[PDB]
Subunit: 36 residues, 3 copies
């Protein structure tokens, strides 16, 4: 019920955090390509 949504929401935040890290690593690759 109320905690089932809490569990789903915590899981989604965790997945979004992991995607953000992968996106930051891609941004860093372009910075390395642009300054070298």
């Amino acid at each position: 019920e109320w905690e089932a949504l809490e569990k789903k929401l915590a899981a989604l935040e965790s997945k979004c955090q992991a995607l953000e890290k992968k996106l930051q690593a891609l941004e860093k690759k372009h910075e390395a390509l642009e300054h070298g």
Copy 2:
């Protein structure tokens, strides 16, 4: 109410899944550039 959050949460998961796929395709492009 309770199902309105359920609907919002299902929509967000669907959008995050679609972003993940686009991020995987970008990662694959860098792998292809790095090994060719």
Copy 3:
């Protein structure tokens, strides 16, 4: 309670929107590299 999840969900959507924009800018960089 009910509005605490609403607040968390609105915050997450806002973070996902900002990641989507950064992902679109990365896609645009590859398009510029592929046609120039």
